Swiss-Prot record:
Disruption phenotype: Impairs atg8-processing. The lineage of its organism: Eukaryota, Fungi, Dikarya, Ascomycota, Taphrinomycotina. It comes from the Eukaryota. This is Autophagy-related protein 2. The chain holds residues 21 to 236 of 1646 of the full protein. It comes from Schizosaccharomyces pombe (strain 972 / ATCC 24843). Residues 165-179 are annotated as: ER-targeting domain. Lipid transfer protein required for autophagosomes completion and peroxisome degradation. Tethers the edge of the isolation membrane (IM) to the endoplasmic reticulum (ER) and mediates direct lipid transfer from ER to IM for IM expansion. Atg2 binds to the ER exit site (ERES), which is the membrane source for autophagosome formation, using basic residues in its N-terminal region (NR) and to the expanding edge of the IM through its C-terminal region. The latter binding is assisted by an atg18-PtdIns3P interaction. Belongs to the ATG2 family. The N-terminal region (NR) associates with the endoplasmic reticulum (ER) and is responsible for the formation of the isolation membrane at the PAS. The amphipathic helix in the C-terminal region binds to membranes and facilitates atg18 binding to PtdIns3P to target the atg2-atg18 complex to the PAS. It is found in: Preautophagosomal structure membrane; Endoplasmic reticulum membrane. Transmembrane segments: none annotated. Residues 170-258 form the Chorein N-terminal domain.
Length: 339
């Protein structure tokens, strides 16, 4: 457990512009774009960071760079701030990380107003500090996160964020079951996803696509889609820094005539209710989970067959993965004919 992992737990990951815990405009892994309530004025900081017109969208590596950069700006601010630095110097890696988390969240200037609790931390009076922090606007903003950071301050270890990691695993399992369930016509039991989490791999064979799903996502008409094999893999060893591997072999699409964000929208309609019900029963959240999920996934596809109408396109192999304005789609072995 490092600071990056706990911050990844607290912020998650998002590709589109989202309103943070404070209500301000934010991108990536908790990178606050602007305080202004206008999206057009929010577009500035991002483009300034990259140096090219983006319309408010970035890549995963850019979000990671912005993440590390934001942590660097955080420690810069801590060392610059007069009230925080003595409190920080006295602390160990874990509590230092909690302080860094707070400064990361609420900015350098705002955090320095917690004079009472800072003074309480220099004297290493963890408990009364915790009780006092429990009564604060920061607790009102992020009660869960505040509970975790406070717990970190109190115990000085990594116990609080492990449970949150567990929760993330469970949520991810539900979201994945719903997603795969949506894409396919097959009934995916929680036990198979449990297989995907116990062992790094899960393979399903002789499936059939949900043409409604494809029609809604791609937005052109799909009549039928059959996939011979679907292989899914999770970075289970490091579930927080998520890496998903999706692979389809023997794809067979049939299309009639007469981007990914929409997927997130579709589920949001159909699943957010059921998902929230499931989470509540387990004791708009699905959007974040799905966003990080689809942002983390790398795609492989082999021996595909697509029909259009009828023309026939045969694809030997194709990969969809990140490279150095977005993810690269490298395709090989396309042969198109008739019958």
């Amino acid at each position: 457990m490092n600071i990056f992992e706990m911050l990844r737990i607290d912020e998650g990951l998002r590709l589109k512009i989202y309103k943070n815990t404070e209500g301000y405009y934010t991108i990536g892994i908790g990178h606050l774009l602007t305080k202004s309530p206008s999206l057009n004025a929010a577009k500035s900081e991002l483009d300034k960071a990259i140096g090219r017109n983006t319309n408010g969208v970035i890549t995963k590596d850019e979000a990671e760079k912005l993440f590390n950069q934001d942590v660097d700006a955080a420690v810069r601010g801590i060392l610059r701030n007069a009230k925080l630095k003595p409190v920080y110097d006295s602390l160990d890696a874990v509590r230092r990380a909690a302080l860094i988390n707070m400064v990361f969240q609420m900015g350098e200037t705002g955090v320095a107003g917690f004079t009472n609790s800072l003074r309480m931390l220099q004297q290493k009076r963890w408990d009364e500090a915790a009780v006092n922090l429990a009564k604060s606007r920061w607790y009102n903003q992020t009660p869960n996160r505040a509970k975790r950071v406070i717990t970190t301050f109190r115990t000085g270890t990594w116990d609080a964020y492990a449970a949150a990691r567990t929760v993330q695993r469970r949520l991810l399992a539900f979201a994945l079951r719903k997603l795969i369930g949506s894409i396919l016509l097959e009934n995916v039991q929680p036990e198979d996803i449990d297989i995907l989490f116990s062992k790094g791999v899960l393979m399903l064979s002789n499936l059939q696509l949900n043409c409604s799903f494809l029609n809604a996502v791609v937005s052109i008409n799909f009549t039928k889609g059959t996939l011979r094999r679907l292989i899914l893999r999770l970075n289970v060893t490091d579930i927080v820094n998520l890496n998903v591997e999706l692979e389809v072999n023997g794809l067979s699409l049939e299309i009639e005539l007469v981007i990914l964000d929409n997927v997130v929208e579709y589920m949001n309609k159909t699943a957010s209710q059921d998902f929230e019900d499931e989470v509540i029963n387990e004791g708009n959240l699905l959007d974040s989970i799905l966003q990080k999920c689809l942002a983390s996934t790398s795609v492989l596809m082999q021996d595909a067959l697509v029909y259009i109408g009828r023309l026939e396109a045969k694809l030997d192999f194709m990969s969809f993965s990140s490279v150095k304005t977005s993810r690269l789609l490298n395709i090989n072995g396309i042969t198109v004919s008739m019958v």
